[PDB]
Amino acid sequence: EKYLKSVLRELVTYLLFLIVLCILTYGMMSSNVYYYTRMMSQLFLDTPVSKTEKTNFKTLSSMEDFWKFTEGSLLDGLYWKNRSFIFYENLLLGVPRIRQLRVRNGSCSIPQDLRDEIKECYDVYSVSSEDRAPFGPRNGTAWIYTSEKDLNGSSHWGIIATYSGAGYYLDLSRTREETAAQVASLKKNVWLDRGTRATFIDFSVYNANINLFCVVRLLVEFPATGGVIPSWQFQPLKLIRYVTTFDFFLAACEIIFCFFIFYYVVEEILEIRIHKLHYFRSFWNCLDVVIVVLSVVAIGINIYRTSNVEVLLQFLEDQNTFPNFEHLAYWQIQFNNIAAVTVFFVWIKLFKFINFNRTMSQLSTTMSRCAKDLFGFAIMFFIIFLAYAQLAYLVFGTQVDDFSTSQECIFTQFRIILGDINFAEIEEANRVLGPIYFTTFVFFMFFILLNMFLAIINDTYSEVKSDLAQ
Amino acid sequence: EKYLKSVLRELVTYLLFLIVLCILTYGMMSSNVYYYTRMMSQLFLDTPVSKTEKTNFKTLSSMEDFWKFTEGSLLDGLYWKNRSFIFYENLLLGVPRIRQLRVRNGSCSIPQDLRDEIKECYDVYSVSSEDRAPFGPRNGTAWIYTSEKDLNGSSHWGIIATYSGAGYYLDLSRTREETAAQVASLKKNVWLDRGTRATFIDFSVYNANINLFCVVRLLVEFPATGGVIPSWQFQPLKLIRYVTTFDFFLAACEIIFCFFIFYYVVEEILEIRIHKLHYFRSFWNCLDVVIVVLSVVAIGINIYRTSNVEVLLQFLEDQNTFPNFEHLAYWQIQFNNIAAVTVFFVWIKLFKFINFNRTMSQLSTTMSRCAKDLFGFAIMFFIIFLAYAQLAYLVFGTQVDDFSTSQECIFTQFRIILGDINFAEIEEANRVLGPIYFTTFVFFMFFILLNMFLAIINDTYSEVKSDLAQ
Amino acid sequence: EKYLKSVLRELVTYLLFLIVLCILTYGMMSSNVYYYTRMMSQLFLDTPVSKTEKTNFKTLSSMEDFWKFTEGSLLDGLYWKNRSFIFYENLLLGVPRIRQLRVRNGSCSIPQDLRDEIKECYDVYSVSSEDRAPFGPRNGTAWIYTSEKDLNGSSHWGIIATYSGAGYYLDLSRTREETAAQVASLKKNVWLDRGTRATFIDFSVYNANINLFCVVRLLVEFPATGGVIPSWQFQPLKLIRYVTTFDFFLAACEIIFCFFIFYYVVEEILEIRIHKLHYFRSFWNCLDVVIVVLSVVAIGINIYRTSNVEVLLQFLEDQNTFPNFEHLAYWQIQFNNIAAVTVFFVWIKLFKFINFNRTMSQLSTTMSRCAKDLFGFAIMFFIIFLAYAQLAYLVFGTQVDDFSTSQECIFTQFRIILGDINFAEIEEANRVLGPIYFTTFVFFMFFILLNMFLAIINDTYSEVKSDLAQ
Amino acid sequence: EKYLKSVLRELVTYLLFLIVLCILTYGMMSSNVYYYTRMMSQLFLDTPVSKTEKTNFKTLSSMEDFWKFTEGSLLDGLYWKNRSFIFYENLLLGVPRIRQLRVRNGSCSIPQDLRDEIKECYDVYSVSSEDRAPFGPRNGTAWIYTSEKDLNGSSHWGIIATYSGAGYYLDLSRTREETAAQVASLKKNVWLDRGTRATFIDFSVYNANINLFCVVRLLVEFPATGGVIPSWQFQPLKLIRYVTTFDFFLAACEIIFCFFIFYYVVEEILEIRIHKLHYFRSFWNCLDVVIVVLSVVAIGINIYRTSNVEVLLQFLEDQNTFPNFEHLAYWQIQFNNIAAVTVFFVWIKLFKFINFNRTMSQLSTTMSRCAKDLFGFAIMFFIIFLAYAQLAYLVFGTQVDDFSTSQECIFTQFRIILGDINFAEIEEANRVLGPIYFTTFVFFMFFILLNMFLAIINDTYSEVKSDLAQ
Ligand SMILES: [Ca+2]
C-alpha cells in the first residue's frame, strides 16, 4: 500500500508542477501578439514599393528595387502624421539604422585567360574578404568602417552567409523629411555598388495598449552572382514586466516554478549520488535530468535577460538615438525556444503514471520492447533516405528551390512522403531523371520500406499480448 | 422464429423512420441555396472597394479601407436602379444598420517609465472597459450608447473577442443618395477613432422566385494593436413555409416524424423502467437516448422558431425600419446543426440490423472487442499529440497563422498528418526549431505511433476470427 | 500437358487481341489533339473580356459581363483577318449560333404577405415553366419559340438543370462587322431579361494540317437567384477518316478487331449453351460477357457514327449556314468512353494467365479468398462514410463549394482521406461543427476504420500461405 | 576472426572511398550556383514582355507575343549599360544566335472534300517534312538553309517533337541598337510564318566572381494547331577548373578516386575470373559491377569533356562571334547525372557491412526473403495500375494537362496515390467517368491493393523472426 500512496503523491506533485508550468507558458502568450506582428509585417512587406510598381520587399530583385523601397514604402510605413506611430497605436522608438557589409575588390583571382576583359572581381562575403577601408565622400559613419565592438553589434545568420556586426552604418532621423534627405544623399553618392554583400534596416516600436515592444530587422543580401535575397524578422518583446495584476500572478507562478526546480534538483542529485553507475540505465532518469537541466538553463537565461533591461533605461534618457534591442530579442527567442522544449518534455513525463490498468501496461510494454528493432530499421531506412537525398541534391540542386541545399532535400523528401509534392518543377528540371527519381522514391519508400516499421510493431504487439496473457 | 420476425418488424419501422427523416432533411436543402449565398458573397466581399483600388472587403487593412468600402462597394451592391433588387430579384428589406462598439480612454495603465511620451491607452475590448458615454456632436443614436435590451440585440462570437449587442448605431436610408450622405456625415465627424473595437453592418434581402430570405452580417474588428480583421456571414432563411405543394408534403412528413419521435420516447421510457439495471450497460440504448433527446431538442427549437415569425409581421407593417432577423438566423443555424447531428446518429443506428451473416457478425465482434485497447492507446497517442501542439503554439504562435491559437495547432497537426502542409512558413518562422519540430513530428507520429492502432486492430481481428471459426 | 498447351494457345490469341486493341486506341489518340483544345480554350475563355476589364468567360458574374464578352472577346477570337481562321490554321466553319431558354412570368406563386411589393416571379427552369410565346420586336427567329424537333437540337446536361434543345435562336454572320451589328441589335432590344435561364454559343472549326474538327459549346446559366454560371466544352472530332496510310492501317486493325469480336461472341455463346445454369458462377465468364457486350456496343456506335457523316455533306453544299455537329460530338464522346472502358476491362483479363508459378497462385488465392469479408466491411465502412457525407451536406451545403451537392460530398471526403483538404473554408463556414466534423472524420476514418481492410487482408494472406505450404 | 578482420579492412577501405566520393560530389556543388540560375531565369522568363503587357516568356500564346518578347524583354535582359553584363557581374560572351526550323507547304494532303477552300497545309515537324529552300529576300544566313554539320549543331528533345541542329539562323550583334535593328528587319520581312515549327535563342554569360559560365537556351515551338509552347534551359558550367586551392584539392581527390576505381576494377575482375558461372548469383557482385561501370563511364565522360575545352579557346581568339557551348553543357549534364547515380549506388553498398548484430541480420533476412513475393505482387499491382493509366489517357487525354501523354498518366496516378490531386479538372473534363475513375482508383488502390505489399512484408517478418529466434 505504501508504493501506491507514494506513486499517488508523486503524481499529485507532478500534476501541480505541470499546471504551474502550463499557466506560465500560456501567460507568456496571447492572441494579441500574433496580429501585432501580422499587421507590422503586412505593412512593411506586402505594400507595393510604390503606387506604379508591383514588387514589394518580399519580391525585391535588384539594387534599384531596394532603393525604391527605402525611399518609398519604408518611409510610408515608418512615419505617420514630431512623434510617429507606425499605426495609430505603436510609437516609433527613437531612430532607425541602416548598415551595410562590404567586400574588397580583388578578394578573388580572375583566370589568366580572361584577365584582359575583366579587371575587378568581388568574392562571396567572408571575414577574410571583408572590406574595412573608407570610400565615397568619406564624410561620416556611413563611409567609414566601424568594428563590431564599437557598434555594439552581433552576428546574424543569413540565408547564404553568416554576417558580422560591423560595417558602415548611418543613423536616420525622427522625421520623414530628414530621413528622405539622408537616403537621397546616400543614393546620390552611390552607397551600394559592386562591393556590397548585405544591408540591414533596424527599428523598434512600442504598443502601450498591450505593453509590447516589436524589434524589426530587414536584411537584403547581394550575392556575388547579382540580384537580391530579401528577408525579415518581427520579434515582440515584454521588457516591462509588472504593470498589471496578471503580471504579479505570473511572477508568483515563476517563483513557485523556481522552488519546484530546486526541489527536483535536490531529489535527483540525492538518487544520483547512490545509483550513479546505473542511473542512466532507466529512460525516466534521463528524462528527469533533461527536464531539470533545461529548466535551470531557462532560469539562467531569464536572469541574464532581466538584467539586460538597462539598455532600455539608456534609450529612455535620450530618445534621439537608436535603441539597440537586438540582443534582448535574441535572448527572448532563445528563452522561448528553451521553455517550449521544457514544456514538451514535461508533458512526455506523464507516461510514468499512465499504467492505470492492464491495457496501459500492455501498450507501454509493447512500445518499450519494440525500441531495439525500431532503431535498427531506422538506421537502415535512413541510409537509403540519405542516399536519395544526396542524389536529389546532385540532380535538382541548381534548378529547384526545394533541393537548393543538402538539408532542404531531407525536408522536401519528408513532405513528398506525406503527400506535399511539386512534381512539375522536378520534371521540368530533369525530364528523364526527375520522373525516375520520383517514381522509384515513392515506390521503394511509401509502398515497401515504410511497412517494415509497422511489421515490427505488429509482431511485437502480438508477442507481448500473447506473453502477458499468462 | 419470433426473434427474427420481431427484428424484421423493427428493421422495417426504422427504415420507414430513416426514409422520412432523409426526406425531411433533403427537402430542407436545395442547390438553389448555395448559389444564392455565392452570388451575394461575390457581390459584397469580392468586388474591389473602388475602381482604382485593389483591396476588397476580404483584404481590408485599416480604417481608411473600411471607409472606402462603406462609401464604395457597399453602396454599389446595396442599391440597384425607391426599391432595390440586389441583382434583379433580391428585394432589399427595410434599411441597413451600422453599429460600433467602443472602449474607454484609460481602461489600461501605461508604465510609469513611458508616461511622459504616451498619455492615452485603450485596452482590448471587454464588458468592463466598454465605453458608454456620448461623444462627437452628440446628435442622435450614432453618438449615444444604447444598451443591448433597448437595441434588441444579442452577443456575437467574433474572431478575437465576444461582443455584446449594445453600442452606437445608425439606421441608414432606403436610397443610395441618403445613405451616402449619412456615411459622409459620420466620416466627417470622426465616427471611428482610437476607441473603436468593432463595427457591424446588417441587412437582409428576399428572393420571391425561390422564397428565401438572406440575413447578412459584416463585422470588422479593430484590435488594440492596429489594423482591421474583416469577417462576414450570409445565412439564408425560410420564414414563409406553406406556399407550394412540396411545402405541405414536408409539413406532413414533419408531423409523421413527430409521431415517430413520440412513439420512440414512449418505448424508451418503458424499456428504461423495465430494464433499469441494464439500460446504460449497452451502447445501443445510449444511442437511442441520444437520438430521442436530439430529436426532442430539434422539435422544441422548431416550435420556438415558428412562434418567432412575428418579427416579419412587425417589419411588414412599416418597411422604412430595420428588419431584425438576427435571432431567426441564429436559431435556424442551431436547428440545422441539431438536425444534421440527428441525421448522422440515425444513420449509425443501422448497425443494429447489419448482422445478416457470419461475416458481418465477425466484423462487428472485432470492432467491439478492440475498443478497450483503442481507447487506451488513443489516450497515450493524444498525450504526445497535445505535447507537440503546445510546443508548436509556443514556438510558431506569434508568427504563423496556422498556429495562432491553441485550438488551431490541433487542426494544423491533423492536416499535417494527412499531408496538407505549409512547411515554408514553419521554416521561415524558426529556421532551427521549425525543421526539427516538423521532422520529429512526422517521424514519431506517421511512421511509428500511428501503426499501434493498426497492430491492435490486426491482432484483435485475428484472435476474433480464430475464436469464432470454431 | 493438355491444359498447359491450351492455356498457351489462348494466351497467344489474347495477346494478339490486346495488341490490336491497344494499337487502335493509341492510334485514335495523339499529342496534337491536347494542344488544339488547349489553345482554343485559352483563346476563348482565358482572354480578358476587354482591354480595361479583368473578368474572363470563366469569371462572368452578371448579364453585363456576358454582353461584354459577346461583343468583345468572342468576336476577337472568332474572326481573324471572307474566310476566318480562328488561328492561322483553324478555319471557321459556317456561322455561329446563339440560343436562349426562357421561363414564363408567374410560373411561381408569391406569398400573399408580399404580393403588394412583388408582382413578377420567375421559377427555376423546367419543361413546365418554359416560355413559348413571342416577345420583343417579334422580328425573326430570335423572338419566336422554335421547338426542339424543328431546331434539330438535343438536351444538354447543365450545372444546375437539364435543358432542352428548343428556344429562341439567331444565326450569326460570316464577318465580324455583321455579327457585331446583330449582337448590338439584340442587346438594344433587351434580348436577355428576367425570364432568361440559359444561353448557348455554338460553332466549329477545322484544322487541315492535322485533319481534325473542334465543336465548341459555351453555356451561361442564369439562376433564379441572380448571377451567371459559365461553362464550356471543346470536343475534337475526326469526321474524315481515310486520308493517310496510318488511317488505312487503323481501318485494317478495326476490321481485325471485328473479326476477333465475332469469334469471341461465338465462343462465349457456345460455352453458355452448355453451362448456362452455372455460367455466371465464375468471375472470368462475367468478365468475358462484359467485354463482348461493350465491344459490340462500341461497334454499333461506330456504325451509327459513320452513317452520320451526312451532316458534313449537307454543310459542304452551302457554307453560309450553321454546321450542326453537336450529335456527332456527343456520339464521339460516348464512343471514346465505351472504348476506354473496354480497353480497361481487356487489360484486367490478363490476370487469367498470370498464374505462372506458386507465388502468383498464392497471391491470386489470397485475393479471391479475401473478397467475401472485404465486401462486408465495404458495406460497413460506407454506411458511416455516407452518414458523414450527409452530415457534411446538411452543415456546409449552402456555404462551401466542395459540399454544394450530395455527390460532391462523397468526392470531397475521398479527397480529404487522401490528403487534399481545404480546412480553411470548412472552419469559416462553421466554427464549431466544422472542426468537430473534420477531426472526428479524420480520426474514425483514417486512424481506425481504414485499418480493418488491412487487418482482413493480412489475416487472409497469412492463412492462405500457411494452408498452401502443404 | 578471419572473416571479421577482413570485413573490417574492407569496411575501412570502402569508408575512405565513400568519403572521397562525397567530397568530390559536394565540391562540384555550391549554394552560389542555385541563385545564379534563379536570377537569370527571373530576369529572362518572369520579366513582363513590356510595361503595358502582362504575358511573360512563360505565358507566350502567339507569334505576336514572341516578337514582342524578342524586341522587348529579351533585349532589356541581354544588354546592360561595348561590353554588356547581364547583371553587374555576368559578362555576356560574344553574340546571341536565333535559329528556326521550317516545314514545306504541301507536306500533308488535304481531303478532297475541302480542297476548294483550303489550298495549303503544313504537317507537324519531321525530318521528312523539313523545308530546305530559300525564302524571303534570300539575303544572308537567315533566309538560307544550313545543315547540321555546317552549323556545328545537335538535336534537341523538345516538348512535342525532337528537332535537328539545322535551320535558318542569324548571328545577332554586340549592342542593343544593332540587335534591335536586325530583329526589326527580320520581323518586317515576315521571318516567322505558317511554315515555322520551332525557334531557338542561345547565348552564354560568364561570372568572374565565382568562375562559372551559364549556357542559356530558349525554345518556342509552333504546333500545327496554332499557338506557341515556350520552354527554357539554364545550365552553369565550370569550364575553367584550376584557379583556387580548393580546385587543386578536388583534382587530388579525383586522382585518388581514379586510383580507387582501378583497384576495384582489378579486384572485381579477379573474382569474376574464378566465379564466372555463379558470379551474378549474388546481388552485391551485381552492385559492384554496376558501380565500376558507372564510375568508368563517368571517368571517360570527364576525359572527353576536359579535352573539349578547345571551344573556349576558339571563342577567346575572337569575341565578336557566337560561343558554341551547347555540347559542353550537354556533356556536363550527362556527367552530373551519372555521378549522382554513382553516388546513390555507392551509398546503397553500405548495407553489406550493416550486419552488426542479430537485429540487423534479422531485418536483412526479412528484406531478402520478401523480394520473391514482392516482385510478383508488383507485377500484379502494376498490371491494374497501367490499365487505369490507359483508361485515364483515353478519357482525359485531350482535356487535362496531367493526362496529356501516356507517361504523364503514370506520374499523375502516383501523385494521386500520395495525395496530390487536381480533382476539379478531372470532374470538369468528364462529369460521369471522371468521378467514377477517381473513386474506383482511390478505393481499389489505396484501400485494398496497397495493403498486399504490407501483408507480405508482415508475414515474412514474423516468419523470419520465429525461425531465427531458435
Ligand atoms: Ca497522404
Numbering used by the authors:
A (entry chain B), B (entry chain C), C (entry chain D), D (entry chain A): 214 to 294, 305 to 693
Q: Can you list sentences taken from the study reporting this PDB entry?
A:
pmcRenal polycystins (PKD1 and PKD2) are ion channel subunits with associated genetic variants that cause autosomal dominant polycystic kidney disease (ADPKD) (1–3). PKD2 forms homotetrameric voltage-dependent and calcium modulated ion channels in primary cilia membranes. Each channel subunit encodes six transmembrane spanning helices (S1 to S6) which fold into structural domains: voltage sensor (VSD, S1-S4), tetragonal opening for polycystins (TOP), pore (PD, S5 and S6), and cilioplasmic (N and C termini). The putative external gate is found within the ion selectivity filter (L641-N643) that is scaffold by two reentrant pore helices (PH1 and PH2), and the internal gate is located at tetrameric S6 junction formed hydrophobic residues (L677).
Between 333 K-665 K particles of the variant channels were extracted, processed, and refined with C4 symmetry to resolve their molecular structures at 2.76 Å (F629S) and 2.70 Å (R638C) GSFSC resolution. On the lipid-facing side of the PH1 in the F629S channel structure, the large phenyl sidechain density which is normally found buried in a hydrophobic cleft formed by cilia membrane and nonpolar residues (L609 and A612) of the S5 was replaced by an unfavorable polar serine hydroxyl. Whereas the polarity of the F629S serine side chain unfavorably dips into a hydrophobic pocket formed by the membrane and nonpolar S6 residues of the same subunit. We hypothesize that this mutation alters the conformational coupling between the VSD and PD and stabilizes the nonconductive state of the pore observed in our F629S cryo-EM structure. The VSDs of the F629S and R638C variants structures are captured in the deactivated state with S4 gating charges (K572 and K575) oriented for hydrogen bonding and cation-π interactions that facilitate gating charge transfer. However, examination of the variant channel’s internal gates reveals key differences in L677 and N681 sidechains rotamers that effectively double the length of its restriction (6 to 8 Å) along the S6. Here, changes in the orientation N681 carboxamides optimize hydrogen bonding distances (3.4 to 2.8 Å) between each protomer. These interactions stabilize the occluded ion-conducting pathway observed in both structures and create asymmetry observed at the inner gate of the F629S channel. Voltage dependence of opening (V1/2) of the F629S and R638C channels were positively shifted (ΔV1/2 = 27 to 32 mV) compared to WT, which dramatically increased the free energy of gating (ΔG°) by 133% (+1.2 kcal/mol), and 152% (+1.8 kcal/mol), respectively.
